Amino acid sequence: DLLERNDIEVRERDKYTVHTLGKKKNSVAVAFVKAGKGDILVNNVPLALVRPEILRTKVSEPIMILGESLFKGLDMNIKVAGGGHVSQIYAVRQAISRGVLASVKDEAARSELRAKLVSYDRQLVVSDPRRCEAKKFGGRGARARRQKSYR
Amino acid sequence: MRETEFCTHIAHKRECRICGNYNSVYRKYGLFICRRCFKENAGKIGFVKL
Amino acid sequence: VRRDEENVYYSKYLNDCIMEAELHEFFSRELVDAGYASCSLCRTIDSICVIIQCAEPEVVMGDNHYRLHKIEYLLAGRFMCDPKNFNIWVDKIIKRGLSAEIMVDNLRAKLEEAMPIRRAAYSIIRTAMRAGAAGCEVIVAGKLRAQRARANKFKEGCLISTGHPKRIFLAEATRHIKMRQGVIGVKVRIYNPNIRGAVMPDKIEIGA
Amino acid sequence: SSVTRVPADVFINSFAAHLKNRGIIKCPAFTDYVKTGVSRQYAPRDADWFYIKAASVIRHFYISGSHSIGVAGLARKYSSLQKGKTTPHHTKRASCKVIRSIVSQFLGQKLLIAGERGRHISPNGRKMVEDFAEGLQ
Amino acid sequence: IPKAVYKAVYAHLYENASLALKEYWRVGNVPGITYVDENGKLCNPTYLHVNCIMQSLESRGVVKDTFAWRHHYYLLTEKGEQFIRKELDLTDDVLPTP
Amino acid sequence: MHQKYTIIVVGKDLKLVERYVKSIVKEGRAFGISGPCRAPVRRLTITTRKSPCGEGTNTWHRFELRMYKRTFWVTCGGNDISTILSKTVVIPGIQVTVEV
RNA sequence: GACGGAGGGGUACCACCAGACGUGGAGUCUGCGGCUCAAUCUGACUCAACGCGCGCACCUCACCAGGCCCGGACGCGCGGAGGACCGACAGCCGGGCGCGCUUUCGCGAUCGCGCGGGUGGUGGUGCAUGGCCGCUCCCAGCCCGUGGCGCGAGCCGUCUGCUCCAUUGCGACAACGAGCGAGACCCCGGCCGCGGGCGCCGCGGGACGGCCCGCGGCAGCGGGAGGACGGCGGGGCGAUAGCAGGUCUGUGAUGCCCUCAGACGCCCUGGGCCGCACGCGCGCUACACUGGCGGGGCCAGCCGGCGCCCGCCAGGACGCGCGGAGCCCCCGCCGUGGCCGGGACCGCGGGCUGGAACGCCCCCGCGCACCAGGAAUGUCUUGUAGGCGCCCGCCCCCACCGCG
């Protein structure tokens, strides 16, 4: 689950042109993109059917802003490990956006496509830096501290 | 006789190497060093800070 | 890919580390006259090599190297290893003044010779300064000829106090010299900016 | 593949009716009045729960494929918190016997085959699971 | 306390020129010292017995001990080497192996 | 003959272990010695109260012994690798072990 | 120097604004005082005592009621190898142990005694001490050489200007050059290369208030950007001078006093430390519907074994080489009722661990307060608070604790 070398272990070859990584809150998604019919699969499951039923629109959000026709013609195999459900829904939208953009690459269309995503939602194509802080002695919380009995 | 009244086993008698103290053996990695005894000998074991 | 977690090898390395620290203490106790500073184990395949950094090798060697021979078999017996396979190689350490552990030993002897605390401390300071320490500090604490406890610190030159460089550039040695009235603990701190291996982070060498 | 295309819950409920209709498993009816998991307190109120658990356990063994997961591992998949104590609640594994009974029926049925360590789904059972999945689609 | 146990301690002292001892309770008696009983197999002298003999030798000064990490570290003295030679019926020709 | 001999280097200090790695790779490079397989670091940790007594706000000293282990794969004659062990630079306090 | 209910500057969620989330109320867990005791071993009491001195059936364990020896070395005067000493069967006493007694067989200086001298002691005195830590101080301050000023104590440097997280800088200046602390450093994290790879793990880069615009001799300041990352990201280290802070019960650290074979040595059995009219400090679980209860989905990380069969679980047997959360989401149900909220108590019973329960686990009962907590008070600014799991430390078993 922790950044293990298990990219090809799920699927052997299959001409996966790209192997993007999207990471949010200790959750990493390796997304493999090849020419397809517009199918996207996450954890060997249809992308539309995702566990947080409320957050199932967040996963499909990059497809909507970029356009279905641009997405059509791509097949993506995404494997998410680490982290938790909401971060895994944030990681896959980031992985999908980065991987679809990789097909355009250094093109002027990519610069527009990166800007198009960055305008609807910035950090959709940019990793979120926030990470958990450590517990410090004298407090149950990272910054919280024990109640002072006297004074 | 004397032997039957001498060190009969009731439980393990475990001591910190260097201190001979039963309290706080700290055998987390089989290092039976006292909590206080360990701080004097940590550099020698090579244990280091951040 | 599949790995068993027994990894007994990590335990083996750790047990030797604890053994090295049992050696450090035993070397300091019996070989105080020798001027022993530090110990390490080569721990070769089947054989034990201990290299001891020490002020004088001959005193540790002994007539016909007999003293070393007894020590090699005492350690071999204690650590349940082949007698004689254990070999200690004593290394004279040059720049004796820089090695704090030799200097607490010298100061402790002077204090037991009843040298005045200022006289004994100043003698240790000059030897370290001649060996090139940028700063030498000796602190003597306890009941100095009084029933009340003082803490006279004698220091000369520049000595750093905090930071990771304290680990690299400061040799801090602690002794517990025993006097009739009561224990007098002495700390000798010696700081060398030029230790060859590393440079002071703060110092900027600049150029012409 | 197939069992994924149909939502997991819409497959398990339909498969529960299928595994009661085809006569697969056959509830022990001695475990019918028992509560799965030391963790819970009031026992299943479904009354067809054995069939839901049976269809869920085959669906797990199908997605496991050659992983060949054990019965204790399946019990840790039905682990919940033991709530109702002043001491803070912690996760507690499900009853091993219930799952052991379910896996035993599948081995006799040959829906699941025995393997080194834990048992895994047999090809004959996989055929039933995927045809049902595609049929729901 | 048996005389043969005393003999083995002296025999170990010429053989190793030293001895290491630990605590009062017996863990395999003292591992590393062995004597043979006439109708007995190779046997270990008890930690209690070895402690008594070596301490008696130490007061006279047969051995000098340093205590580190819960272990005595006896080293044979010159006076002790003379004593061990009389004890084992040895001569000035014999020198301790180390 | 031709067996596989597993060398494992266990060292507390990273720079010391990296030096052993350089010598082992260099001596066996001709013998097809494998590149270093770095083990997940064993960050054995003891956290103890700084005070001998219980007085003061409880403070904690966080001590971490990191052990770095490199596994080496060489397939060749046994006699050569026995000599290869002598050839590689000896680092004091660092251990090597060969398992067939 | 210290203090000021003196002035002027600052500065901090250990301080407040603005908000959050609590304690105090209750039931429990667990310390502390008081009480009772055979003993309830003690340390310490504002911050800087009170889940603190790293998990008390025995051991720990220092306390109480019985008991057992030497583990009193060594050296001298004396005695002594056919008896210095030392062992015991059976009964008898004694929880008990030739422990002793009756008794009548063993053994061999393993030496006895007196004296001198030890070896010990969780025994005292932390206000005799070392060492270590806590606190002043989440401070930014401390100081030297040479010169100047005063009889001097003591000043100047070391600044009543500005700036900064900060003697952090700049502009000055009877001061002129330094040093320590601050910064740098170190560990970690996030991002990008390169090399390796049983396993993600080795070596480097990147960010500097650099750019842009305003404002500022300046030091900087406010924005705008680009950029994983923006202006102390979180930790480690920690000046100077002290405290008569704490630890002699961590220590072959230790002065001195006590003890020192009817032992304060070291063990052995039993019992306490865990009692409890009560007062108080951490915590924990609740007071419900944003909830409880049933199935189903299923998600980690410090870091990490499993299978099969039986048992209601708890747990067991027999094997082998391995492996993973709650919350939340989804569908039902109860439905404002101290109710199915809550789970305190208490009666059988089933397990476990150990030598032994009084320890723990579990099954059917049983169904306490509490319907939101007065006067007070505490912690906290982003992956933070809070909610929610999980691991480890000590450990036979055991966490409402600590550290992660």
Say whether the CB atom of A145 is under 7 angstroms from strand G: yes
Residues 47-86 of F with CB under 7 A from strand G: 47-62, 68-69, 71, 73
SS3 C69: helix
Min CA distance, C63 vs chain B (Å)?
31
Pairing mode, strands C36-41 and E63-68: unpaired
Say whether the CB atom of E41 is under 7 angstroms from strand G: no
Q: For residue D110, give both structure tokens.
A: 């040959």
CB atoms within 10 A of CB D62: 21
d(C-alpha A76, C-alpha A98), whole Å:
12
Pairing mode, strands F60-76 and E35-36: unpaired
- Pick the closest to residue E64 from C22, C77, C70, B20 (CA basis): C70
CA angle F84, F88, F90 (to 5 degrees): 130
SS3 A85: helix
Q: Which of B3, B6, B33 to mutate to test the interface with E (most CBs of E within 10 A)?
A: B6
Distant-in-sequence, close-in-space partners of A34: CB < 8 Å, separation ≥ 6: A14, A15, A16, A17, A74, A75
Q: Which of C8, C18, C175, C176 to mutate to test the interface with B (most CBs of B within 10 A)?
A: C18
- Pick the closest to residue D98 from D10, D37, D23 (CA basis): D37
- Pick the closest to residue A89 from A38, A26, A24, A30 (CA basis): A24
CATH of C9-92, one of 3.30.310.50, 3.90.220.20, 3.30.300.20, 3.10.105.10: 3.30.300.20
d(C-alpha D12, C-alpha D53), whole Å:
8
Looking at chain F from residue 11 to 30, which residues have their Cβ under 8 Å from any Cβ of chain B? 12
Resolution (A): 3.3
d(C-alpha E87, C-alpha E34), whole Å:
17
Question: Rounded to the nearest 5°, which phi and psi values hold at C177?
Answer: -60, 140
d(C-alpha C158, C-alpha C140), whole Å:
19
CA C6 centroid distance within chain: 36
d(C-alpha A91, C-alpha A96), whole Å:
9
d(C-alpha D6, C-alpha A57), whole Å:
19
Distant-in-sequence, close-in-space partners of A32: CB < 8 Å, separation ≥ 6: A7, A11, A14, A16, A18, A19, A76, A77, A78
Distant-in-sequence, close-in-space partners of C144: CB < 8 Å, separation ≥ 6: C117, C150, C152, C184
- Pick the closest to residue D19 from D54, D49, D45 (CA basis): D54
DSSP state of C94: S
CA angle A34, A38, A40 (to 5 degrees): 75
Contact residues on chain B for C18, CB-CB shorter than 8 A: 17, 31, 33, 45
d(C-alpha B27, C-alpha B16), whole Å:
9
In chain D the first and final C-alpha atoms are separated, in Å, by 12
Give residue F64's domain range.
4-99
d(C-alpha C79, C-alpha C62), whole Å:
23
Q: CA separation (Å) from A9 to A6, C88, C143?
A: 5, 52, 72
CB atoms within 10 A of CB C99: 24
d(C-alpha C158, C-alpha C137), whole Å:
9
CATH 3.30.300.20 location in chain C: 9-92
CA dihedral (C188, C191, C194, C195) positive or negative = positive
Question: Rounded to the nearest 5°, which phi and psi values hold at F4?
Answer: -105, 125
Task: Report the length, in residues, of chain C.
Answer: 208
Q: Å between C59 CA and G191 C1'?
A: 58
d(C-alpha C76, C-alpha C84), whole Å:
7
CB atoms within 10 A of CB D130: 15
Q: Which experimental technique did the depositors report for determining this structure?
A: cryo-EM
Q: For residue A113, give both structure tokens.
A: 């496509």
Residue A137, burial from CB neighbour count under 10 angstroms (0-12, 13-18, 19+): middle
Return the amino acid letter for C6: E
Q: Which nucleotides of G are covered by protein (CB under 7 A)?
A: 14-15, 22-23, 27-29, 43-44, 46-50, 52-55, 58-61, 67-69, 71-75, 87-88, 96-99, 109-111, 118, 122, 128-135, 179-191, 195-203, 228-229, 233-242, 244-247, 250-256, 266-269, 281-286, 292-316, 320-330, 332, 342-344, 355-356, 361-364, 377-386, 388-396, 399-404
SS3 C154: strand
- Pick the closest to residue D101 from D71, D77, D126, D66 (CA basis): D71
SS3 F100: coil
Looking at chain A from residue 26 to 45, which residues have their Cβ under 8 Å from any Cβ of chain F? none
d(C-alpha C193, C-alpha C199), whole Å:
7
Number of separate domains in chain F: 1
CB atoms within 10 A of CB E26: 15
Contact criterion met (CB below 8 Å) for B39 and B49: no
Residue A126, burial from CB neighbour count under 10 angstroms (0-12, 13-18, 19+): middle
CA angle D13, D16, D22 (to 5 degrees): 145
Question: Rounded to the nearest 5°, which phi and psi values hold at F13?
Answer: -95, 130
Which architecture does CATH list for C100-191? 2-Layer Sandwich (3.30)
d(C-alpha A99, C-alpha A102), whole Å:
5
Contact criterion met (CB below 8 Å) for C125 and C104: no
Q: CA separation (Å) from D80 to C137, D48, D92?
A: 63, 20, 6
SS (HEC) of chain D: CCCCCCCHHHHHHHHHHHHHHCCCCCCCCCCCCCCCCCCCCCCCCCCCHHHHHHHHHHHHHHHHHHHCCCHHHHHCCCCEECCCCCCCCCEECCCHHHHHHHHHHHHHHCCEECCCCCCEECHHHHHHHHHHHHHHC
Residue D2, burial from CB neighbour count under 10 angstroms (0-12, 13-18, 19+): middle
Looking at chain B from residue 10 to 29, which residues have their Cβ under 8 Å from any Cβ of chain C? 17-18, 29
d(C-alpha C142, C-alpha E49), whole Å:
42
Say whether the CB atom of A131 is under 7 angstroms from strand G: yes
Q: Tokens 């700290």, residue? A: B26
Q: Å between C202 CA and G8 C1'?
A: 37
Q: What is the dihedral of CA A80, A81, A82, A84, to 10 degrees?
A: 50
Contact criterion met (CB below 8 Å) for E13 and E84: yes
